[PDB]
Protein backbone atom coordinates (compact mmCIF):
# COMPACT_ATOMS: atom_id res chain seq x y z
CA UNK A 1 0.00 0.00 0.00
CA UNK A 2 0.77 3.69 -0.12
CA UNK A 3 -0.81 6.71 1.59
CA UNK A 4 -1.36 9.24 -1.16
CA UNK A 5 -2.34 12.91 -1.10
CA UNK A 6 -5.67 14.49 -2.05
CA UNK A 7 -5.40 17.00 -4.88
CA UNK A 8 -7.83 19.36 -3.17
CA UNK A 9 -7.56 19.02 0.60
CA UNK A 10 -4.10 17.51 0.76
CA UNK A 11 -5.15 14.67 3.04
CA UNK A 12 -3.71 11.18 3.47
CA UNK A 13 -5.73 8.67 1.42
CA UNK A 14 -5.55 5.25 3.05
CA UNK A 15 -6.20 2.29 0.68
CA UNK A 16 -9.66 1.93 -0.83
CA UNK A 17 -11.00 5.00 0.93
CA UNK A 18 -11.84 7.60 -1.69
CA UNK A 19 -12.12 8.16 -5.41
CA UNK A 20 -9.73 8.76 -8.26
CA UNK A 21 -10.32 10.93 -11.30
CA UNK A 22 -8.54 10.98 -14.65
CA UNK A 23 -8.95 14.16 -16.68
CA UNK A 24 -8.65 14.15 -20.48
CA UNK A 25 -5.06 15.45 -20.32
CA UNK A 26 -4.13 12.26 -18.30
CA UNK A 27 -3.69 14.19 -15.03
CA UNK A 28 -4.65 11.80 -12.18
CA UNK A 29 -6.44 13.41 -9.23
CA UNK A 30 -7.41 11.81 -5.93
CA UNK A 31 -10.11 12.79 -3.46
CA UNK A 32 -10.41 11.42 0.05
CA UNK A 33 -14.14 12.11 0.18
CA UNK A 34 -17.06 13.41 -1.84
CA UNK A 35 -16.72 16.83 -0.16
CA UNK A 36 -13.38 17.46 -1.87
CA UNK A 37 -14.53 15.64 -5.02
CA UNK A 38 -17.76 17.64 -5.46
CA UNK A 39 -16.02 20.94 -4.80
CA UNK A 40 -13.46 20.09 -7.50
CA UNK A 41 -16.26 19.49 -10.05
CA UNK A 42 -17.68 22.86 -9.03
CA UNK A 43 -14.26 24.32 -10.06
CA UNK A 44 -13.51 25.90 -6.72
CA UNK A 45 -10.07 27.20 -5.68
CA UNK A 46 -8.42 25.39 -2.72
CA UNK A 47 -6.43 28.52 -1.80
CA UNK A 48 -9.85 30.11 -1.26
CA UNK A 49 -11.40 27.11 0.55
CA UNK A 50 -10.65 27.51 4.25
CA UNK A 51 -10.26 23.99 5.67
CA UNK A 52 -7.69 22.81 3.08
CA UNK A 53 -3.95 22.30 3.68
CA UNK A 54 -3.24 24.59 0.72
CA UNK A 55 -5.04 27.53 2.37
CA UNK A 56 -3.25 26.70 5.64
CA UNK A 57 0.22 26.86 4.10
CA UNK A 58 -0.59 29.91 1.97
CA UNK A 59 -2.06 31.87 4.86
CA UNK A 60 0.80 30.83 7.19
CA UNK A 61 -1.13 28.95 9.85
CA UNK A 62 0.59 26.38 12.03
CA UNK A 63 3.95 27.88 11.14
CA UNK A 64 6.11 26.00 13.68
CA UNK A 65 8.09 24.38 10.82
CA UNK A 66 10.54 27.13 9.79
CA UNK A 67 12.97 28.91 12.13
CA UNK A 68 15.73 30.62 10.07
CA UNK A 69 18.54 29.94 7.60
CA UNK A 70 22.05 29.29 8.91
CA UNK A 71 25.22 31.09 7.81
CA UNK A 72 28.82 29.95 8.28
CA UNK A 73 31.18 32.44 9.95
CA UNK A 74 34.61 31.57 8.52
CA UNK A 75 36.91 31.44 5.47
CA UNK A 76 37.82 28.61 3.09
CA UNK A 77 40.63 27.72 5.58
CA UNK A 78 43.15 26.20 3.16
CA UNK A 79 46.55 27.84 2.76
CA UNK A 80 47.75 24.69 0.99
CA UNK A 81 50.77 24.57 -1.36
CA UNK A 82 50.66 24.82 -5.13
CA UNK A 83 52.60 21.50 -5.70
CA UNK A 84 55.76 23.52 -6.40
CA UNK A 85 55.99 25.76 -3.37
CA UNK A 86 56.91 23.59 -0.32
CA UNK A 87 54.25 24.66 2.28
CA UNK A 88 56.89 24.34 5.03
CA UNK A 89 59.19 26.76 3.15
CA UNK A 90 56.11 28.88 2.37
CA UNK A 91 55.61 29.55 6.08
CA UNK A 92 59.40 29.93 6.34
CA UNK A 93 59.40 32.76 3.79
CA UNK A 94 56.47 34.40 5.61
CA UNK A 95 58.74 34.52 8.69
CA UNK A 96 61.64 35.71 6.49
CA UNK A 97 59.49 38.69 5.37
CA UNK A 98 60.65 40.95 8.28
CA UNK A 99 64.24 42.16 7.85
CA UNK A 100 63.37 42.96 4.22
CA UNK A 101 66.98 44.03 3.42
CA UNK A 102 67.25 41.27 0.77
CA UNK A 103 64.80 42.91 -1.64
CA UNK A 104 66.38 46.29 -0.77
CA UNK A 105 69.84 44.95 -1.67
CA UNK A 106 68.41 43.40 -4.84
CA UNK A 107 67.00 46.84 -5.67
CA UNK A 108 70.40 48.43 -4.92
CA UNK A 109 72.02 45.76 -7.10
CA UNK A 110 69.47 46.30 -9.90
CA UNK A 111 69.87 50.09 -9.59
CA UNK A 112 73.59 50.06 -10.38
CA UNK A 113 72.76 47.26 -12.85
CA UNK A 114 70.28 49.54 -14.63
CA UNK A 115 72.90 52.32 -14.50
CA UNK A 116 75.52 50.19 -16.31
CA UNK A 117 72.82 48.90 -18.69
CA UNK A 118 71.88 52.40 -19.91
CA UNK A 119 75.58 53.35 -19.90
CA UNK A 120 76.72 50.55 -22.22
CA UNK A 121 73.61 51.02 -24.38
CA UNK A 122 74.36 54.75 -24.82
CA UNK A 123 78.01 53.87 -25.52
CA UNK A 124 77.03 51.47 -28.33
CA UNK A 125 74.65 54.07 -29.80
CA UNK A 126 77.51 56.59 -30.07
Amino acid sequence: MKVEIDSFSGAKIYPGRGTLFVRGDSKIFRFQNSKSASLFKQRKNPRRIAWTVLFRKHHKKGITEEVAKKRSRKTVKAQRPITGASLDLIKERRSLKPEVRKANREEKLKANKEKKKAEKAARKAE
Binding site: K69, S72, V76, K77, A78, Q79, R80, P81, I82, T83, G84, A85, R93, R94, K97, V100, A103, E106, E107
Partner: protein
Amino acid sequence: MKLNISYPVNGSQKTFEIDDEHRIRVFFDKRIGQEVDGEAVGDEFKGYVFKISGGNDKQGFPMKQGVLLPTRIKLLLTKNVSCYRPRRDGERKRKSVRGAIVGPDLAVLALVIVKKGEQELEGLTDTTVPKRLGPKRANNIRKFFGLSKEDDVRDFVIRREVTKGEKTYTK
Protein backbone atom coordinates in the same frame (compact mmCIF):
# COMPACT_ATOMS: atom_id res chain seq x y z
CA MET B 1 22.30 4.74 -4.00
CA LYS B 2 25.71 6.46 -3.88
CA LEU B 3 27.27 9.12 -1.66
CA ASN B 4 29.79 11.35 -3.46
CA ILE B 5 31.45 12.84 -0.38
CA SER B 6 34.07 15.61 -0.50
CA TYR B 7 36.44 17.39 1.90
CA PRO B 8 37.11 20.89 0.55
CA VAL B 9 40.14 21.94 2.64
CA ASN B 10 42.09 18.82 1.70
CA GLY B 11 40.36 19.07 -1.70
CA SER B 12 39.67 15.34 -1.61
CA GLN B 13 36.64 13.42 -2.88
CA LYS B 14 35.35 9.83 -3.08
CA THR B 15 32.23 7.84 -4.04
CA PHE B 16 30.60 5.31 -1.69
CA GLU B 17 28.14 2.72 -3.04
CA ILE B 18 25.49 2.67 -0.31
CA ASP B 19 22.89 -0.02 0.57
CA ASP B 20 21.15 -0.71 3.93
CA GLU B 21 17.80 0.85 2.88
CA HIS B 22 16.72 1.77 6.41
CA ARG B 23 20.04 3.49 7.06
CA ILE B 24 19.12 5.68 3.99
CA ARG B 25 15.44 6.31 4.89
CA VAL B 26 17.07 8.83 7.27
CA PHE B 27 18.31 10.69 4.14
CA PHE B 28 14.71 10.80 2.82
CA ASP B 29 12.72 14.06 2.99
CA LYS B 30 15.72 16.34 3.15
CA ARG B 31 16.47 19.46 1.15
CA ILE B 32 19.67 20.91 -0.17
CA GLY B 33 21.82 22.74 2.37
CA GLN B 34 20.41 20.52 5.15
CA GLU B 35 22.61 18.47 7.47
CA VAL B 36 21.86 14.87 8.53
CA ASP B 37 23.62 12.36 10.80
CA GLY B 38 26.95 10.73 10.00
CA GLU B 39 26.30 7.78 12.34
CA ALA B 40 22.94 7.07 10.70
CA VAL B 41 24.55 6.43 7.32
CA GLY B 42 27.69 4.81 8.76
CA ASP B 43 29.57 4.17 11.99
CA GLU B 44 32.74 4.89 10.01
CA PHE B 45 31.31 8.45 9.87
CA LYS B 46 29.96 8.35 13.47
CA GLY B 47 29.99 11.82 14.99
CA TYR B 48 30.58 13.43 11.58
CA VAL B 49 28.21 15.93 9.95
CA PHE B 50 27.91 16.78 6.26
CA LYS B 51 26.06 19.29 4.06
CA ILE B 52 23.91 18.04 1.17
CA SER B 53 25.50 19.68 -1.88
CA GLY B 54 23.36 18.09 -4.59
CA GLY B 55 23.05 14.99 -6.75
CA ASN B 56 21.93 13.22 -9.89
CA ASP B 57 18.72 11.18 -10.04
CA LYS B 58 17.98 8.50 -12.64
CA GLN B 59 18.14 9.61 -16.30
CA GLY B 60 21.01 11.89 -15.23
CA PHE B 61 18.97 15.07 -14.72
CA PRO B 62 20.67 16.91 -11.85
CA MET B 63 19.28 18.34 -8.64
CA LYS B 64 18.80 22.08 -8.74
CA GLN B 65 18.73 24.09 -5.56
CA GLY B 66 15.75 26.16 -4.68
CA VAL B 67 12.95 24.47 -6.58
CA LEU B 68 11.56 22.95 -3.34
CA LEU B 69 9.68 19.87 -4.50
CA PRO B 70 10.70 16.24 -5.28
CA THR B 71 9.22 15.50 -8.72
CA ARG B 72 10.94 16.44 -11.97
CA ILE B 73 9.96 19.63 -13.81
CA LYS B 74 10.79 21.57 -17.02
CA LEU B 75 12.33 25.06 -16.50
CA LEU B 76 13.24 27.83 -18.97
CA LEU B 77 16.83 28.11 -17.86
CA THR B 78 19.25 30.93 -18.77
CA LYS B 79 22.91 31.92 -18.22
CA ASN B 80 24.43 32.43 -14.72
CA VAL B 81 22.34 29.48 -13.51
CA SER B 82 23.08 25.80 -12.94
CA CYS B 83 22.25 22.92 -15.29
CA TYR B 84 22.44 24.83 -18.59
CA ARG B 85 25.26 26.54 -20.48
CA PRO B 86 24.08 28.88 -23.28
CA ARG B 87 25.83 28.57 -26.66
CA ARG B 88 24.87 32.19 -27.50
CA ASP B 89 24.18 35.37 -25.59
CA GLY B 90 20.49 35.68 -24.96
CA GLU B 91 19.73 31.99 -25.62
CA ARG B 92 17.19 30.75 -23.09
CA LYS B 93 16.21 27.10 -23.27
CA ARG B 94 13.67 24.73 -21.75
CA LYS B 95 15.33 21.83 -19.97
CA SER B 96 14.04 19.19 -17.58
CA VAL B 97 15.58 18.94 -14.12
CA ARG B 98 14.92 17.37 -10.72
CA GLY B 99 14.24 19.49 -7.66
CA ALA B 100 15.63 20.26 -4.23
CA ILE B 101 14.08 17.52 -2.03
CA VAL B 102 15.57 14.04 -1.59
CA GLY B 103 13.66 10.85 -2.32
CA PRO B 104 13.88 7.35 -3.85
CA ASP B 105 14.10 8.75 -7.41
CA LEU B 106 17.71 9.85 -6.72
CA ALA B 107 20.67 7.65 -7.48
CA VAL B 108 23.73 9.72 -6.44
CA LEU B 109 23.73 12.29 -3.63
CA ALA B 110 26.70 14.68 -3.43
CA LEU B 111 27.88 15.69 0.07
CA VAL B 112 30.54 17.97 1.53
CA ILE B 113 32.10 17.68 5.01
CA VAL B 114 32.08 20.64 7.44
CA LYS B 115 33.51 18.94 10.56
CA LYS B 116 36.12 16.21 10.99
CA GLY B 117 35.30 13.65 13.68
CA GLU B 118 37.44 11.64 16.09
CA GLN B 119 38.44 8.69 13.85
CA GLU B 120 40.06 8.79 10.40
CA LEU B 121 38.86 8.43 6.82
CA GLU B 122 40.85 6.56 4.20
CA GLY B 123 40.49 8.79 1.10
CA LEU B 124 39.62 12.23 2.46
CA THR B 125 41.68 13.44 5.43
CA ASP B 126 45.00 11.56 5.07
CA THR B 127 45.50 13.08 1.58
CA THR B 128 45.47 16.65 0.27
CA VAL B 129 45.51 17.87 -3.33
CA PRO B 130 47.51 21.06 -4.06
CA LYS B 131 46.43 24.42 -5.49
CA ARG B 132 46.57 23.85 -9.26
CA LEU B 133 47.42 27.54 -9.88
CA GLY B 134 49.23 30.25 -7.94
CA PRO B 135 47.94 33.80 -7.49
CA LYS B 136 48.51 35.91 -10.62
CA ARG B 137 47.72 39.23 -8.91
CA ALA B 138 50.05 41.49 -6.93
CA ASN B 139 47.72 42.19 -4.02
CA ASN B 140 46.48 38.60 -4.00
CA ILE B 141 50.09 37.60 -3.28
CA ARG B 142 50.43 40.54 -0.88
CA LYS B 143 47.51 39.68 1.37
CA PHE B 144 47.95 35.89 1.06
CA PHE B 145 51.59 36.34 2.25
CA GLY B 146 51.35 39.48 4.40
CA LEU B 147 54.57 41.18 3.31
CA SER B 148 54.43 45.03 3.10
CA LYS B 149 53.66 47.82 0.65
CA GLU B 150 57.09 47.77 -0.98
CA ASP B 151 58.88 44.42 -0.65
CA ASP B 152 59.16 43.60 -4.42
CA VAL B 153 56.38 41.07 -5.05
CA ARG B 154 58.16 40.13 -8.36
CA ASP B 155 60.68 38.03 -6.40
CA PHE B 156 58.27 36.57 -3.79
CA VAL B 157 56.54 34.78 -6.76
CA ILE B 158 55.79 31.00 -6.87
CA ARG B 159 58.21 28.95 -9.00
CA ARG B 160 57.11 25.53 -10.35
CA GLU B 161 60.13 23.57 -11.57
CA VAL B 162 59.80 21.19 -14.54
CA THR B 163 62.43 19.51 -16.74
CA LYS B 164 62.37 19.47 -20.53
CA GLY B 165 65.51 17.36 -20.80
CA GLU B 166 68.04 18.12 -18.11
CA LYS B 167 67.35 21.85 -18.39
CA THR B 168 64.86 22.72 -15.66
CA TYR B 169 62.91 25.92 -15.27
CA THR B 170 60.05 27.37 -13.29
CA LYS B 171 57.88 28.96 -16.08
